[model samples]
Target: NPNYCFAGKTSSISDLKEVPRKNITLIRGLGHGEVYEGQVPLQVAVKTLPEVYSEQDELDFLMEALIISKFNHQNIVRCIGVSLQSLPRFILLEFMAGGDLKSFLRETRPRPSQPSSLAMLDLLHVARDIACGCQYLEENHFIHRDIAARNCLLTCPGPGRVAKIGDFGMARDIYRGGCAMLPVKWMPPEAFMEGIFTSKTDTWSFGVLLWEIFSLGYMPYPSKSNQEVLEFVTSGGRMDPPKNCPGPVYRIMTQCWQHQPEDRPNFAIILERIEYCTQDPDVINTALPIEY
Candidate 1:
């Protein structure tokens, strides 16, 4: 049973019709007000091209659905199922209440509405979680063409939030070959120019994602356009370390962004280095000083 019949319908959605994701719809569980499987709200990725469907598209969807369901790790998004009731397919996923990492870091930058979420150690944990997921994919010989803070999903609220990597629309098996427009800022020099896709290319994107985490979501290469990014990298330009970022952490990030893809550290090395930096659990967990 690779596909699931949507338990609810479009007519049932009224007040709950919010948080749209590409032709989004608010759905109800068969026995509850929210999605039933996880005891949390569910998100569905609705296929936008309802009128245009082909055998190849259908096969691709089915392949991704099956592949994603096999990913069993905390740092990966949980796919409930794919729906095949009609041409406009839907992908049910676990609802991440904290939203994407981009928005999460933004709230922490100026002044945090919730102080607990701003813990330095927890943010590092979020980084590690992403690394673990990427490592898993790399080990399984999958290349996540797009990896950035925008694609990292956060779970729930409160101090101990978990980060999971999502948005696999660009994901492909490592052996596959094709070139398409990719996020310029996060791309490696080879990928941006030659259209080379590899695990090392993913490593390069992870470095940019690390910058996003430490900089509180500042746009990468802010003053530079995509063309400038290509020019800058060719001219040996890389972003400076985020303000007050740990020396070792920044070092690891830079290693990932090496111009030569073969020279970049793999996710395994990155994960190991992250573990070394986060050996102390209380780095972000101690109580803040009390204000009289």
Candidate 2:
């Protein structure tokens, strides 16, 4: 019955197997802690809490695991279990071999020596997958405050790669609290100004994520400081469409950025539009002139 609990309920430590340190191989470091490739007798990603964390950090970590455990979608990362029997609590997740979407987009950018491997359709598919995940979260009353390329992960490294929404480190219930530092650029004015976070706030961030997809991972509002971004957004400023971006896709981004939260389309609508693009070669085949 562990899987059948309330949305905010944290899983008991006893419910998860205590994975041994020897079985995990440290792969790299993450902002919150380190990521490890591990075998809990099965391939998994071990996301360990920081060695020295506050009580709040522990709560956040456990909350992330709790939230992810409730998801049962192909486009959302699956949580295998957790290891909280000892120090440095661990949240075991399905390992994404392709790494994060932001890094992958940048690395695959076309250069004199390297050509872009991703087609417009490939990027569209990733966007569609994320929207699908967001739609699920929305229906379940989870508001993923952060929805950016950096927060998404890919199952593999090439064409046909499956993109899954990951990194719930900053996610919370539709009804929630304030964090220390927010992603100003990706956030809507209401989120940064009034500290409001609703499904529409996620829609705003998803718009920025789409820009990231079309821009091939370029940081949104390039060269703008956090304060500047806040000012710009509040003043009705928005980034121009990425070079050669399809008209339909740009339209979706604009709709997502509507000043009024209620004006933005929900993830279900976003997913439908993207699905339409996938079927139309004229919409999906337009090449974006890579800039890097």
Candidate 3:
């Protein structure tokens, strides 16, 4: 069972190299925890659980680490190691200096005096990178239930930035309990209603993530509550493309949100569509209509 090589790279507390506290610098707070900039002799992002957390929290933390360790994709964030030997356990990952895509888009949004920092091709590259990562997961039988701009990290700032999928806290075996919180805005109807998650569901979320990229990080279904989103989606509603979203990209987004999960294009096809967009001069030259 080469595919089920889950046991191949399992890491124990002993496998973790000790990271000295003094060498770890608290960088900023991520949703459930804080990320520290550190060196295991090499730069890494150290993720730590909050002081007070529940058993489920611990399970999710370890689950994320376990899942991430098995992955080996350039478009997927790399897990260096974990330090579970001490009170404050740490998950060492490749440091993303450019930070999360959500913040990056928001910060680099077009301003009165300046145009958007990202060119159309750059934006397409980010979308393509994420699609590539998701395609890998689909091939590996993994379902990233949560896929959004916030969960995607950029390797560096400006040109040549690489987007890598990160944050596996919501990723788990399909049969897991359904009581956990979900990213409702990103969910397809099947996910929120039936608690079903598959690669197709991930496709749906990726569509929303594309919207986030083109919208310059605007929240999906803006001003809509989670309940509202569920109702809207269940009633066959879909979001309009961001103003001035390129035709090719918007077409991919629509295909991803098809009401029938089976009808939705898989990541492989989505990746192909993105690649096609990248090669077209007409698409590449078309810029997002940014407001000053």
Candidate 4:
């Protein structure tokens, strides 16, 4: 049975259906939040570790699972539980229907399928949702060192489609340090130079995510290599606003790109600025379709 094969624990086998093949697999089934025994349209992901690995790896996975378990937010994927007593250790999470924001923008062209079909308000809301998640993390004294479009997941598609930040492999407590290499394209000047990880560094990454959203998933500094991006950013080079992007929204991105970490607006102010941009109804029509 697929359930028995991957459940990792004997008792958890019945709790899962349409079981996954990988240690960390996304599947669909009943959610822990459901009130009844009936299966809903919920998609759940089960993360697991190898049956035989270093004890350190096992401990690391345990810590990651614990951290994710503490998160409770609409803008963050929910972790249900972990299977620790068995061979195929597992961690369950809410599955995202819309997939990662990067692919949604890159692959979805203007078509009848409504795959790439998103309005300006939709974009604004997605941005706000990301900010809300980050704000929650900031307030709790946690730092998400990697905040990018690739790391952001979209809920089931519709007018209410929401963007939720996921992938906490690089996340750390405010007083902790564990990140090794940084994503140069998203790093702030201070973070890139000093090897520091802070809320402001995350703020800098947020600006890059903003760039990706506005450009419909276009690569930041498309023409620059990693070293080139470093030089360009250090030389005061920043991305130009996408075609038809609202001035206010782009302004917020610029603020997030501040040279000094202290000068960058916190998630609170970023959310406020985005809310201001949303007040203009025409912002929806302003998003330019990415050229194939």
Q: Cα deviation in Å at residue 21, candidate 4?
A: 14
Segments in model 2 whose C-alpha atoms lie over 4 Å from true places: 1-32, 172-180
Q: Each model's C-alpha lDDT? A: 0.69, 0.82, 0.82, 0.72
Q: List residue ranges in candidate 4 displaced over 4 A.
A: 1-43, 111-116, 172-181, 290-292
Give per-residue CA lDDT, model 3, range 109-219, as digits (tens): 777665756678888989999999999889887788999999999999879899999788776443124544568999999898988888899999999999999888999
Q: Please give the range of 10 consecutive residues that has the lowest summed lDDT in model 2.
A: 172-181
Q: Give the TM-score of candidate 2.
A: 0.88
lDDT of 2 by residue, 44-68 (tens): 8889888688776676676667767
Candidate 4 C-alpha lDDT tens digits along 193-230? 88777888888899889889877788898888888889
Model 3 off-target regions past 4 Å? 1-32, 172-181
Model 1 poorest 10 in a row by lDDT: 7-16
By TM-score rank, best first, the candidates go 3, 2, 4, 1
lDDT score, candidate 4, position 242? 73
lDDT score for candidate 1 against the true structure: 0.69
Please, what is the TM-score per model?
A: 0.74, 0.88, 0.89, 0.79
Q: Regarding lDDT, does 1 or 4 come out ahead?
A: 4
lDDT of 2 at 127: 93
Model 4 score (lDDT): 0.72
